[PDB]
Amino acid sequence: AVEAQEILRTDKELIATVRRPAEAEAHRIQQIAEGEKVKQVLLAQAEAEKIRK
Amino acid sequence: AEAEAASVRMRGEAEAFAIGARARAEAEQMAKKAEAFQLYQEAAQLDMLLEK
């Protein structure tokens, strides 16, 4: 029974330790990727119209 | 990758339009060169030969 309670505790600990940080990291990566994509698109548009003019 | 592809597409389209712009300008430019050259006599050809 000691080890069964330890199983439950380590399940919850692994959740709080790696499962949620993984989701937070995924959200951070996708947010930063969105920012970088918008920045690159705007810079490319600026360069293209520079070349056109 | 989508951002890079859009960048390449837009920059290439802009530079191609610029190439077309100089193309039209140079064509309308050379038409008058030919028109002017049409009115050249022996004196003008002699001047060109002695300049070259």
Swiss-Prot record, chain A:
Location of this chain's protein in the cell: Cell membrane; Membrane, Caveola; Endosome; Membrane
Post-translational modification: ZDHHC5-catalyzed palmitoylation may be required for the formation of higher-order complexes and for neurite outgrowth in cultured neural stem cells.
Recorded superkingdom: Eukaryota
Disulfide bonds: none
Function: May act as a scaffolding protein within caveolar membranes, functionally participating in formation of caveolae or caveolae-like vesicles. May be involved in epidermal cell adhesion and epidermal structure and function.
Record-stated family: Belongs to the band 7/mec-2 family. Flotillin subfamily.
Quaternary structure and interacting proteins, as annotated: Heterooligomeric complex of flotillin-1 and flotillin-2 and caveolin-1 and caveolin-2. Interacts with ECPAS.
Protein name: Flotillin-2
Full-protein positions shown: 269 to 321 of 428
Curated annotation (Swiss-Prot), chain B:
Subcellular location: Cell membrane; Endosome; Membrane, Caveola; Melanosome
Protein function: May act as a scaffolding protein within caveolar membranes, functionally participating in formation of caveolae or caveolae-like vesicles.
Subunit-level organization: Heterooligomeric complex of flotillin-1 and flotillin-2 and caveolin-1 and caveolin-2. Interacts with ECPAS.
Family as reported in the entry's similarity comment: Belongs to the band 7/mec-2 family. Flotillin subfamily.
Protein's name according to its UniProt entry: Flotillin-1
Native source species: Homo sapiens (Human)
Lineage: Eukaryota, Metazoa, Chordata, Craniata, Vertebrata
